[PDB]
Swiss-Prot record, chain A:
Post-translational modification comment from the UniProt entry: Phosphorylated on both serine and threonine residues. Small t antigen inhibits the dephosphorylation by the AC form of PP2A. O-Glycosylated near the C-terminal region.
Miscellaneous field: The sequence shown is that of strain 776.
Domain of life: Viruses
Function: Isoform large T antigen is a key early protein essential for both driving viral replication and inducing cellular transformation. Plays a role in viral genome replication by driving entry of quiescent cells into the cell cycle and by autoregulating the synthesis of viral early mRNA. Displays highly oncogenic activities by corrupting the host cellular checkpoint mechanisms that guard cell division and the transcription, replication, and repair of DNA. Participates in the modulation of cellular gene expression preceeding viral DNA replication. Isoform 17kT antigen targets host RBL2 for degradation and promotes cell proliferation. Transactivates host cyclin A promoter through its J domain.
Organism: Simian virus 40
Domain notes: The J domain is essential for multiple viral activities, including virion assembly, viral DNA replication, transformation and transcriptional activation. The LXCXE motif specifically binds to host pRB, RBL1, and RBL2.
DNA-binding region of this protein: 11-126
Protein name per the record: Large T antigen
Cell location: Host nucleus
Curated annotation (Swiss-Prot), chain B:
Portion of the full-length sequence here: 202 to 270 of 270
Gene: RPA2
Family statement drawn from the similarity comment of this UniProt entry: Belongs to the replication factor A protein 2 family.
First and last residue of the signal peptide: none
Segments crossing the lipid bilayer: none
Induction annotation: Translationally up-regulated in response to DNA damage (at protein level).
Region (Interaction with RAD52, TIPIN, UNG and XPA), start-end ranges: 1-69
Compartmental location: Nucleus; Nucleus, PML body
Protein name, UniProt field: Replication protein A 32 kDa subunit
Subunit structure of this chain's protein: Component of the replication protein A complex (RPA/RP-A), a heterotrimeric complex composed of RPA1, RPA2 and RPA3. Interacts with PRPF19; the PRP19-CDC5L complex is recruited to the sites of DNA repair where it ubiquitinates the replication protein A complex (RPA). Interacts with SERTAD3. Interacts with TIPIN. Interacts with TIMELESS. Interacts with PPP4R2; the interaction is direct, DNA damage-dependent and mediates the recruitment of the PP4 catalytic subunit PPP4C. Interacts (hyperphosphorylated) with RAD51.
Role played: As part of the heterotrimeric replication protein A complex (RPA/RP-A), binds and stabilizes single-stranded DNA intermediates that form during DNA replication or upon DNA stress. It prevents their reannealing and in parallel, recruits and activates different proteins and complexes involved in DNA metabolism. Thereby, it plays an essential role both in DNA replication and the cellular response to DNA damage. In the cellular response to DNA damage, the RPA complex controls DNA repair and DNA damage checkpoint activation.
Post-translational modification as stated in the protein's UniProt record: Differentially phosphorylated throughout the cell cycle, becoming phosphorylated at the G1-S transition and dephosphorylated in late mitosis. Dephosphorylation may require the serine/threonine-protein phosphatase 4.
Length: 131, 69
């Protein structure tokens, strides 16, 4: 248009590692929140001490910020969506289930997708999953 | 609906229905299900991990669950 184009979904560069559906009646761990840097900053500290995420990181995409976190406690996808959707009083929110954690992080660490802050010392590893 | 094998269904159930706070270790899986070979259990664990039902709490052998309803 003439200003910042606000999308309603994730970029094609990450859609390949996403489950797409959020109302999927299944358990998940990896969740990504496409929002504003200010919003992702709040969720960064809130979700961390709310679900005791094993890993949380704020990444820069194109026009917004992507909060990538992995919850150890198993729960339904929609359970997280309801919580995130609730905090959309000052900014939008695109939270969807991640199909491939390590794979998504791999894309979130290349050229356009920059790494701002993260809890783990060097992204995700084999210690967060099961070989 | 149940996109899992009957064999794996029991494996996952044994872990989530375990009265142990540690959940169910790999050494415990083969202990309970003696008819389950290590090779088979490892595959099931990997699948259950991809299914997001189980996870390595503080070790690859230390399996734990939360949601499997």
């Amino acid at each position: 248009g003439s200003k910042v184009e606000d999308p309603k979904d994730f970029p094609s560069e990450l859609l390949s590692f996403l489950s797409h559906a959020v109302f999927s009646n299944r358990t998940l761990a990896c969740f990504a929140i496409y929002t504003t840097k200010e919003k992702a900053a709040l969720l960064y500290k809130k979700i961390m001490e709310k679900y005791s995420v094993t890993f949380i990181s704020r990444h820069n995409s194109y026009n917004h910020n992507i909060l990538f976190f992995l919850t150890p406690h198993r729960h339904r996808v929609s359970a997280i969506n309801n919580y995130a959707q609730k905090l959309c009083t000052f900014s939008f929110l695109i939270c969807k289930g991640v199909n491939k954690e390590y794979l998504m992080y791999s894309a979130l660490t290349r050229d356009p997708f920059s790494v701002i802050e993260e809890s783990l010392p060097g992204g995700l590893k084999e210690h967060d999953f099961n070989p | 609906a149940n996109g899992l094998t009957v064999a794996q269904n029991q494996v996952l159930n044994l872990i989530k229905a375990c009265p142990r706070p540690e959940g169910l270790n790999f050494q415990d899986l083969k202990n309970q299900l003696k008819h389950m070979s290590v090779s088979s259990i490892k595959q099931a664990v990997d699948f259950l991990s991809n299914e997001g039902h189980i996870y390595s709490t503080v070790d690859d052998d230390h399996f734990k669950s939360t949601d499997a309803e």
